[PDB]
Design a protein around this ligand. Structure first.
Ligand code: ADP
Ligand code: ADP
Ligand code: ADP
Lengths: 421, 421, 421
């Protein structure tokens, strides 16, 4: 790996965006001219951490975001700018409250046991009007819009541009779909080592929002952006691999899954409640859990349970939504899963039923149904909090304030239903 | 007591409003011509209970609301109509889920022990525009509007009319004030036997709303109707009396209070959390508990604690808000208090401090901070649920549905704070 | 077979639209980058079938749409994209509820008797404003607009573009007409093997809609889109052929038709009622049957009957409308016809009269006059239902639901005519 300064000269990069993800998933970046990249690659870009979602004080020394040169992406729509993901450092060490640092820590524990997490994300999003008031396509109106050829091709320019970028970047994109809400789309690409996928997922949201804007549109990954439409998931596909390239999840047990997979699964099931706080991290998230289908079960090739087993050597957690932190969520999933493996956790019986029809009759534990309860579940889950380190309590702090902020709002519903009390 | 038919002939009453209060405090009434009052006074007015907030089925027999002839009030603004409060009966017996029946049951238990609850209510309300969008007086704007002579006299017509009605009805009204929010008023009258006060409180809200409408205005008892203004309380004054006319609360202990009073108080303190669900019964209610001042303490002549001791032989519960059921709330207070007396409950130390300044430093139990948590507190409080009978679980059911209804609403705050997640 | 990956390289195709038609005729497609076509061509593109009109559950495994490489069409207006028609497979076999699969089944039965159905379609459509409120040409206004030269040429650019595409695609287009309603047009091309014509029919609607949109206009195949104008037919021309290449309908009987042709006709007459549900598949469809001409008769070179004999070796079914599924329609027609042939059905006497003038005096069976009755007829016709397989029952299920949805709408007619009852 050559230096970024030399790459800048060779590939015509004039500015670098040195970037990191805070606790709320917000992309924080600094635009640095190429003349300054050498110093910053080694010493890091200085940011006042208290000004981001990092649970820091104005009295603290500036954090130093150290770029991972392997993450470099020349913006495909603006190649004279080089994007870099970074680890936030504080007082000479990675700062445990930064999502990407948290993720790297859990990975290092799994890696030490020769277990390498790989995942793929299904990042649904909506294409909407710039003012956010409606979807971008007024002609996308029918009751079952999923895979609608007409509406898909009406947004060919934006979708095709983005997919072609992903081809060039080497993500191995393989399908673009219109999803089951009007105005909603999904663009899939190959799974990879968790850190690779996490970096891609963070960049992907930024690319989609950016390219949409250039087309006079807007993209949102909001969990439930419209009252009358279903929402955005981020269903996650999970497998564990040895450094020698074998999928520990492949086995001769049920459905081609191994004991390791089922123990991992058992951690997922066992830690589902606190896990919800992290993978459904906003007040808005909880609308998708109250629509009925809010219990903890799996699985099989069945898109009706919290966990689906799509094929051999693979689990799909169907819990995370569009707001899920690209680093915190694989981190939290891995912590729960690793615990499952170590404790030989038992997932219980696979249910081969349609939960939307027969779910009412199944005795199952229930997920937390609002942000506050979910945070409480996270705080009571010591194994999970310990797996995320200091990030967990900082996350719980912020979400509790969001909760109180939300509840303090005077809504129309309140006035409509209470004015005559 | 003569018959209502004979009174109708003598006082020129052409219609009776036979009325009862459901679990949400909603006044349900039927307008019956005088020719039919005799049968209904004895047999009751038939209502389909499932259509009110009574937790009933369409398959149930109609309830029979039996008028309390002693409650009769010729509408002062329309004397040809006679208003009556009623006990809802079902299958030949008072229906334990009806608020007024619940209240009468608790009273009968206290009465059996020669303890007679008397209370006064401070029913603050706002005078607002008919469309509810702003207060009725655009010139009522200053930062400290409390007792504002100008704004008070600007609403003299409406206030004076209502107070004069209360004089004629024999309620012993003694003061009308502009309260500490712009547009907010209060009109006090003498305390009385709980059932008398409860009937008056129910009628009072109706009279104020009715008279406001006749003046082209509107009244609301909503807890927190405006984002920028403080809200409506219903602080309640409480004492217990023997049939021989002695105030059991008067004594030689601290502040002129007796051991009975302090044990009653101890029930209040001891049952405060579940009590909150009943006396802060709406989602909206909880805004007033998050503004800081949400802990459980008393007292002294100090408007800064959950309980104030204004004078000898008197407790003021400063907890209830404008949405409090006129029957359920004295009922719930009495259940908690009676328990305190029977268990010789200990309130702990009176705090002679200003909670708004030093509250942060006091170790005290905290009230529930949202409707859901408050309902949970009610459900966990067996003594309190048992004291209200079947009304308690029916109340909890409805409020839980209100909670889920509220949370399902897509708010602007959500879109503003999450669209860019 | 030069593979799709190879064809993509040489033809410069960057994306494929893998498409299938659902039970409501809706085009469902996935946009796949060339780099992924090889795998999808072999294994199929995955779709959640419950999200389309296929009568499935979210608990079902995804269907796999397997593309027919012989259907490949480079979109003539956007040749970097390659459209493919696909067969829906479920759990390792063709999904009988998918129209194209159902059609292929019926064709295989017939093929097994050396009878190969060939058909051509007259897919009338309107050109309208994007908002759908009026036709595209405000100057197209005369009482008898059929074949209007001015209006035809006023839309030359769009019509000519589409026709030239059909020339290049090898469909053998031969005429473009302005039809007998203002704003209505028709573009004819050579008949072919049923499956070829079906795929083309499906693609054609998409082409016309897409090209219209590129010209700032819009196309609709809605059966009756305007209250004041006549509607869109999809009249179908039908013949049966041996593999040797002879037209089984050509014979010595009347009008140059054979006994086989007449028995086929007899199946059409015999199953006309049930057939109506499939080829008039919407509530809106039934307007064209209540506008008189709704009895079951043929024929001769006479456009006044349900079936017309245009010439030797050919039958024209004048029943299907613009909403007819391009796959279900020929399938249902073939099912009926084959039965006619197997049972030696007697079509009755040819009526050489004008049904518009003398039709009232003829004794003939009447077609069903609304969607509900038509569905009932489909369900009662077990020979027809059995011939379409599971597609029939799923179709009827959806249509019964559409019917209930329609009836549940509060129409202005209802209010105008009932408000004063
Ligand atoms: N063994 C695996 N481990 C982790 N992720 C995987 C694995 N296999 C596939 N994926 C990823 O899961 C995501 C979804 O894949 P997909 O084949 O579309 O699943 P499905 O057919 O169930 O919808 C993709 O990003 C994909 O690359
Ligand atoms: N001994 C009592 N028991 C119950 N309520 C009382 C008692 N004495 C007064 N009240 C009532 O309490 C309410 C408030 O009285 P008020 O004298 O204005 O109290 P404060 O001075 O503390 O504001 C009135 O309705 C009043 O009649
Ligand atoms: N023998 C046949 N079998 C099936 N379809 C046919 C046959 N001959 C013609 N067609 C198709 O029927 C459609 C109508 O043909 P056309 O010549 O316009 O007849 P008409 O003048 O009666 O409308 C055309 O699309 C044509 O391809």
């Amino acid at each position: 790996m050559t230096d970024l300064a030399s790459i800048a000269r060779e590939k015509g990069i004039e500015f670098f965006l040195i970037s990191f993800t805070d606790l709320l998933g917000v992309q924080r970046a600094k635009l640095v001219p190429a003349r300054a990249i050498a110093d910053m690659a080694v010493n890091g870009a200085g940011f006042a951490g208290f000004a981001a979602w990092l649970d820091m004080s104005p009295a603290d020394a500036d954090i130093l975001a150290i770029p991972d040169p392997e993450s470099l992406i020349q913006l495909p729509w603006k190649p004279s700018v080089g994007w870099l993901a970074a680890d936030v450092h504080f007082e000479g060490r990675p700062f445990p409250k930064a999502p990407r640092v948290a993720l790297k820590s859990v990975l290092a524990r799994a890696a030490g046991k020769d277990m390498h997490l790989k995942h793929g994300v299904e990042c649904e999003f909506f294409l909407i009007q710039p003012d956010g008031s409606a979807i971008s396509d007024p002609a996308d109106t029918q009751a079952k819009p999923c895979y609608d050829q007409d509406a898909l091709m009406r947004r060919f320019d934006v979708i095709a541009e983005i997919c072609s970028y992903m081809v060039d970047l080497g993500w191995g994109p393989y399908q673009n779909d219109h999803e089951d809400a009007n105005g909603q789309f999904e663009m899939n690409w190959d799974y990879a080592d968790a850190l690779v996928t996490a970096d891609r997922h963070a960049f992907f949201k930024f690319m989609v929002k950016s390219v949409a804007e250039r087309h006079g549109l807007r993209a949102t990954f909001m969990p439930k952006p419209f009252a009358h439409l279903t929402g955005n998931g981020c269903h996650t596909h999970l497998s564990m691999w040895t450094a020698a390239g074998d999928n520990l999840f492949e086995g001769d047990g049920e459905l081609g899954l191994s004991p390791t997979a089922y123990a991992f699964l058992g951690g997922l099931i066992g830690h589902a409640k606190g896990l919800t706080a992290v993978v459904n991290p906003t007040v808005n998230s909880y609308k998708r859990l109250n629509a009925s289908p809010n219990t903890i079960t799996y699985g099989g090739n069945n898109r009706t349970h919290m966990v689906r087993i799509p094929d051999a050597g693979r689990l799909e957690l169907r819990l995370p939504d569009g707001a899920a932190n690209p680093y915190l969520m694989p981190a939290a999933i891995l912590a729960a899963g690793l615990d499952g493996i170590e404790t030989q956790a038992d997932p219980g019986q696979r249910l081969d039923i349609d939960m939307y029809v027969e779910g009412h009759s199944v005795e199952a534990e229930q997920l937390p149904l609002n942000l506050l309860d979910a945070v409480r579940a996270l705080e009571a889950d010591e194994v999970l909090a310990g797996g995320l380190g200091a990030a967990a309590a900082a996350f719980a702090k912020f979400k509790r304030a969001e909760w109180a902020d939300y509840k303090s709002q005077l809504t129309e519903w309140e006035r409509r239903t209470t004015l005559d009390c």
